[PDB]
Ligand SMILES: CCCCCCCCO[C@@H]1O[C@H](CO)[C@@H](O)[C@H](O)[C@H]1O
Ligand SMILES: CCCCCCCCO[C@@H]1O[C@H](CO)[C@@H](O)[C@H](O)[C@H]1O
């Protein structure tokens with residue numbers, strides 16, 4: 001039975017592909033890199049999808065248990081999210097298939113959150129100790145992804161609806177998360193999910209940049225400032241994060257890193273803090289590269 | 300002694316009147332509908348005002364008790380709020396009386412919040428269990444209403460001050476509310492007040508649209524996205540909300556619904572997501588219609 | 599051994615100097631006032647710096663203890679903050695020295711927050727009772743100050759990064775703070791730090807106005823509305839704040855007051871709510887004047 005969190009791997013790859021895609025006109029070779037990443041991401045995605053279908057068929061009670069858990073349910077959101085990203089990738093070759101995947105991912109994530117998260121407002125199941133970074137996945141990241149993907153297909157206003165849902169849900173959840181981390185923190189086996197704390201700002205700004213045609217304005221800059229603050233915090237925290245050793249869970253970081261890379265390209269195109277953008281692009285690529293090496297070593 | 304929450308009924312009606320008012324030039328008959336609602340709202344308001352004056356005279360200790368409660372005090376805010384809305388209505392016939400009611404409502408709500416809510420920051424009276432949706436009424440809804448009403452009279456910058464107070468107070472309160480609902484939720488007899496959770500975004504966007512002359516921009520769209528997210532959540536939660544049976548408390552929903560309707564008209568005028576706007580207008584009207592039928596049945 | 603909080607005194611003075619500086623072209627004499635304040639602030643700053651160096655040399659374990667405390671550490675942030683403000687002042691005479699102080703303050707505050715605040719996310723040291731207004735100093739005020747100071751030197755985009763970090767950190771911290779004040783509040787000896795609750799909006803809008811060349815737009819007005827709401831709340835709370843008597847801790851208020859004054863000038867220049875701006879300027883000056891009188895009386 002495939003661990004649901006493993007969908008984090010094509011996610012990272014997929015998102016990195018998109019970042020590279022935006023560098024084509026400045027640097028033709030980028031296209032190749034993008035294509036390669038795209039294909040690899042897509043491949044893994046297919047595989048995992050198949051594996052997950054098998055899970056649904058044989059290990060269904062496992063799926064049901066992770067679904068009902070007020071903590072683990074969030075990772076199921078990785079499935080429509082990656083679906084959408086693969087859509088994005090496939091758009092460069094076949095827009096129709098892409099659109100199909102994007103609508104499936106969007107409807108899927110909306111249905112999922114509606115059911116499960118509202119259910120959380122019923123009370124008594126979610127605990128203070130359930131306040132985990134993974135909660136950003138159904139609540140926030142899925143909506144940003146829908147916003148960017150819909151923008152890709154030319155549904156910009158719709159995109160703005162999903163973007164708004166994402167951004168405000170982000171601002172509404174993060175306060176209690178950070179208070180919780182200050183007071184009880186996390187057990188070590190959860191510590192890698194701290195990586196997800198890096199994602200919101202960057203994913204936010206990426207989605208934002210996708211909807212407003214890459215215009216780097218005041219909001220984008222603001223979002224970047226908070227993003228880099230969170231990056232410095234997590235960098236200083238990293239030895240503590242990996243106190244009990246390196247693991248595959250570190251793939252959490254990938255989503256934020258990839259988004260950082262993506263947003264970096266827009267900042268570069270608009271000639272805004274180009275040195276910072278180059279540093280961000282390179283740093284995120286190196287880090288995800290190390291994740292890939294680590295992962296191959298384990299395999 | 301009149302239950303203070305009953306002011307929720309003219310509130311709903313009043314707000315719906317305003318929504319219909321904005322459809323006059325597109326659909327002359329709307330004016331009639333608006334007028335009718337206006338008058339009815341105004342009528343009930345007068346009645347309730349009179350009843351409340353009587354309360355002040357004879358059941359004063361009851362008023363004092365609801366005032367001192369860290370939970371029930373919030374409903375008193377319904378009185379200046381509805382005052383203002385009646386002002387809005389009456390503006391179509393007599394701007395001077397309207398202005399009088401609007402300033403009375405504005406000063407009243409500001410005084411009320413200053414005294415009572417700051418007092419809450421003194422500590423020791425408010426409890427974790429006091430974290431109720433009703434708190435949005437003095438903290439958030441009253442300021443949005445002041446903003447829109449002041450905008451009506453041409454005091455736009457002042458309007459922006461109240462709008463800002465409302466929006467930021469909203470974002471500052473909602474995180475702890477939603478964490479609380481996730482963990483302990485609410486006893487059934489409070490569950491109808493979940494309806495108030497629908498209001499902020501829509502009331503926000505309505506106020507915003509009133510101050511910026513109905514221009515549908517990026518902020519308005521964002522606000523709508525979060526509004527509809529909350530709507531879907533509450534729709535899925537509705538059987539749970541009315542688990543112990545239908546009641547008059549369901550009038551909570553009305554404020555959000557009416558605002559949804561109101562904002563829908565601006566979206567329709569600006570040709571933004573017109574299908575969505577029509578659906579929102581119709582849905583909110585049908586729902587408030589059902590509230591009215593239910594209410595007459597009880598009477 | 600100098601109490602670290604004493605850096606609040608030149609801070610206030612420094613910030614007030616800057617406010618007066620902006621009134622020169624409208625009122626030549628303002629320049630003199632500004633200059634005087636500047637010099638005085640600078641003088642005290644030097645003194646305190648020297649004293650603090652001595653602290654580092656002889657009472658180091660005291661410094662270490664305040665550093666490790668999840669409550670008292672925040673006041674150390676007053677040192678880079680005031681450093682920057684003195685930079686601002688000195689800019690009118692010598693831009694190079696100013697730039698040196700500004701970069702020292704900026705790097706210092708960033709390093710400080712990175713280390714200490716991230717460390718807080720490690721868990722187990724910070725308690726619910728550690729949720730104090732003073733936390734705004736490293737998390738929020740330092741970044742706003744960096745943003746405005748950097749804007750002064752012409753690094754506007756960089757300024758936007760720090761501004762964004764500040765604003766979003768503000769919105770992310772305040773919800774749990776205000777819930778905490780509602781439930782357990784503060785012991786009397788901490789109550790003066792309630793003054794810091796006045797600062798964020800005003801400091802925010804000041805920084806914002808510095809980066810966007812004094813243009814009073816919708817964001818600025820919004821920020822002001824919330825600022826004045828918090829002012830009214832604190833005014834009503836003031837007798838409770840000083841229940842156990844007047845003290846030097848009241849210098850907390852100064853930062854907010856000075857910023858109010860500063861932002862007032864921009865509002866005055868842009869002809870936006872000029873009556874309100876005059877009232878704000880005068881009120882803040884009178885209040886800080888009273889702080890100065892009180893302080894001299896104690897000396
Ligand atoms: C942003 C991308 C998120 C990275 C996903 C990797 C999360 C690995 O982490 C683990 O995942 C498991 C799910 O399979 C969970 O059951 C565990 O609770 C979690 O710790
Ligand atoms: C989480 C809170 C984020 C605040 C978003 C701030 C948006 C800033 O808004 C800015 O206003 C300017 C007016 O001078 C315009 O010129 C810019 O285009 C606009 O983006």
Ligand SMILES: CCCCCCCCO[C@@H]1O[C@H](CO)[C@@H](O)[C@H](O)[C@H]1O
Pocket residue numbers: 302303304305306307310371374488489491492495547548550551552553554555
């Ligand atoms: C947005 C409009 C709010 C709807 C008001 C209906 C609230 C009904 O609800 C009840 O109201 C009573 C006040 O009379 C309170 O004492 C009760 O606590 C509350 O449950």
Ligand SMILES: CCCCCCCCO[C@@H]1O[C@H](CO)[C@@H](O)[C@H](O)[C@H]1O
Pocket residue numbers: 168212215217218219516517518521
């Ligand atoms: C709660 C946080 C809400 C964030 C509000 C986002 C405001 C978006 O700001 C937008 O900036 C654009 C610049 O491209 C302008 O063109 C738009 O007019 C402006 O509204």
Ligand SMILES: CCCCCCCCO[C@@H]1O[C@H](CO)[C@@H](O)[C@H](O)[C@H]1O
Pocket residue numbers: 601602603604605606609670673787788790791794846847849850851852853854
């Ligand atoms: C915005 C400016 C902040 C005002 C600083 C005055 C704070 C006085 O207050 C005291 O300061 C001491 C630090 O010396 C702390 O140890 C105490 O906890 C605190 O109460």
Ligand SMILES: CCCCCCCCO[C@@H]1O[C@H](CO)[C@@H](O)[C@H](O)[C@H]1O
Pocket residue numbers: 467511514516517518815816817820
């Ligand atoms: C904390 C959340 C703050 C929300 C910031 C709202 C920014 C409002 O954004 C405004 O959009 C307008 C479009 O009509 C533009 O004309 C204004 O310049 C822009 O500032």
